[PDB]
Design an enzyme around this catalytic site. Sequence first.
Site, PDB file in Angstrom:
ATOM      1  N   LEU A  79       0.808  -1.220   0.000  1.00 55.40           N
ATOM      2  CA  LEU A  79       0.000   0.000   0.000  1.00 55.40           C
ATOM      3  C   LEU A  79       0.842   1.271   0.000  1.00 55.40           C
ATOM      4  O   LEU A  79       0.295   2.375  -0.033  1.00 55.40           O
ATOM      5  CB  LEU A  79      -0.930  -0.014   1.205  1.00 55.40           C
ATOM      6  N   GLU A 108      -6.792  -7.307   0.224  1.00 52.35           N
ATOM      7  CA  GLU A 108      -8.244  -7.357   0.177  1.00 52.35           C
ATOM      8  C   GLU A 108      -8.780  -7.339  -1.245  1.00 52.35           C
ATOM      9  O   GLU A 108      -9.889  -7.835  -1.501  1.00 52.35           O
ATOM     10  CB  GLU A 108      -8.816  -6.158   0.932  1.00 52.35           C
ATOM     11  N   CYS A 253      12.689  -0.607  21.072  1.00 58.15           N
ATOM     12  CA  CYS A 253      12.181  -1.884  20.612  1.00 58.15           C
ATOM     13  C   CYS A 253      13.212  -2.980  20.889  1.00 58.15           C
ATOM     14  O   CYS A 253      12.853  -4.058  21.344  1.00 58.15           O
ATOM     15  CB  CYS A 253      11.825  -1.816  19.133  1.00 58.15           C
TER      16      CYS A 253
HETATM   17  N1  LIG Z   1      -3.771  -4.616   3.318  1.00 63.16           N
HETATM   18  C1  LIG Z   1      -2.389  -4.542   2.926  1.00 63.16           C
HETATM   19  N2  LIG Z   1      -2.234  -5.213   1.802  1.00 63.16           N
HETATM   20  C2  LIG Z   1      -0.999  -5.287   1.189  1.00 63.16           C
HETATM   21  N3  LIG Z   1       0.085  -4.683   1.740  1.00 63.16           N
HETATM   22  C3  LIG Z   1      -0.110  -4.010   2.878  1.00 63.16           C
HETATM   23  C4  LIG Z   1      -1.312  -3.933   3.484  1.00 63.16           C
HETATM   24  N4  LIG Z   1      -1.203  -3.172   4.608  1.00 63.16           N
HETATM   25  C5  LIG Z   1       0.092  -2.814   4.688  1.00 63.16           C
HETATM   26  N5  LIG Z   1       0.763  -3.300   3.622  1.00 63.16           N
HETATM   27  C6  LIG Z   1       2.167  -3.156   3.283  1.00 63.16           C
HETATM   28  O1  LIG Z   1       2.935  -4.130   4.249  1.00 63.16           O
HETATM   29  C7  LIG Z   1       4.214  -3.722   4.277  1.00 63.16           C
HETATM   30  C8  LIG Z   1       4.631  -3.678   5.788  1.00 63.16           C
HETATM   31  C9  LIG Z   1       6.131  -3.766   5.992  1.00 63.16           C
HETATM   32  N6  LIG Z   1       6.431  -3.694   7.421  1.00 63.16           N
HETATM   33  C10 LIG Z   1       6.677  -5.101   5.427  1.00 63.16           C
HETATM   34  C11 LIG Z   1       8.158  -4.953   5.101  1.00 63.16           C
HETATM   35  C12 LIG Z   1       8.703  -6.012   4.169  1.00 63.16           C
HETATM   36  N7  LIG Z   1       7.855  -7.196   4.121  1.00 63.16           N
HETATM   37  C13 LIG Z   1      10.113  -6.386   4.733  1.00 63.16           C
HETATM   38  O2  LIG Z   1      10.324  -7.529   5.150  1.00 63.16           O
HETATM   39  O3  LIG Z   1      10.982  -5.460   4.706  1.00 63.16           O
HETATM   40  C14 LIG Z   1       4.220  -2.341   3.608  1.00 63.16           C
HETATM   41  O4  LIG Z   1       4.800  -2.442   2.328  1.00 63.16           O
HETATM   42  C15 LIG Z   1       2.713  -1.942   3.556  1.00 63.16           C
HETATM   43  O5  LIG Z   1       2.440  -0.960   2.473  1.00 63.16           O
END
Ligand SMILES: Nc1ncnc2c1ncn2[C@@H]1O[C@H](C[C@@H](N)CC[C@H](N)C(=O)O)[C@@H](O)[C@H]1O
EC number: 2.1.1.-
Length: 271
Positions: A79, A108, A253
């Site tokens: 997102l 979603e 953290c």
């Molecule tokens: N409903 C959603 N659907 C898809 N992506 C989402 C959603 N909500 C949050 N995100 C994305 O989830 C990710 C959250 C991050 N903390 C993940 C980091 C990444 N997976 C890493 O390992 O570095 C972001 O890119 C958000 O934009």
Amino acid sequence: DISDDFFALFLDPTWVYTCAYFERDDMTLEEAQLAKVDLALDKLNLEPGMTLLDVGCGWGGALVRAVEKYDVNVIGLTLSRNHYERSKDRLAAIGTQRRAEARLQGWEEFEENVDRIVSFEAFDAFKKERYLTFFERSYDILPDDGRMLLHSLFTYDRRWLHEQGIALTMSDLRFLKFLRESIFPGGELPSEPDIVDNAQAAGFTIEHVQLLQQHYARTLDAWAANLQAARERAIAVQSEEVYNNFMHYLTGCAERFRRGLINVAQFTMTK
Ligand SMILES: Nc1ncnc2c1ncn2[C@@H]1O[C@H](C[C@@H](N)CC[C@H](N)C(=O)O)[C@@H](O)[C@H]1O
């Protein structure tokens, strides 16, 4: 609102911004991030040419690793525009005959069949009212023998902490308030039952849970050390207020993972 140029000062070249895995003690941050991605992807039993979905793909590091090492087709959802743009560019720059796409789209809205799903610290960004819906959707888009590797943070309540000899202090409550009122994760973390009970209700079996609590402490320490070493450049990219806020988040953290107040784990989920 935080520029990629700020994050670049403390992350490793994979741009991975989640708990690393120091599979060997002398691994560099980059090696430990790739080890964490590989730890998860190995649990999915990927064969070349399968299609892997990364829900919440960040700046694309796991997607890139999946293509390069596992030779799979990949779809990443995010997102965040900045996450999407870097993922898009990085995937386009991979030389592969496979399909590799990043999308600015929430899970979603995603309804395409995929062979396997991975997700690293996205689930805590979902509203609790969507926890079950997420597992239902994930179950629906996977084949009969599909697998999902959910890497997620989770929290513990006072009673459980107490039984383990751990107490939440006034400072911890203030830190939680700081997390909620900031751009940082950890304010509204799910419980372990929020993950397990909803996954099982959707039809998944929890085949394995691998806790990574102390790996996160170490990861956060490394990010903090990197940011402090680049303090002047970080202040120039953003400001001293933002720099100090990030250092507070990273070190606060790290302290709390070491103390055991929260956790992070990889849940291997099968059909
Ligand atoms: N409903 C959603 N659907 C898809 N992506 C989402 C959603 N909500 C949050 N995100 C994305 O989830 C990710 C959250 C991050 N903390 C993940 C980091 C990444 N997976 C890493 O390992 O570095 C972001 O890119 C958000 O934009």
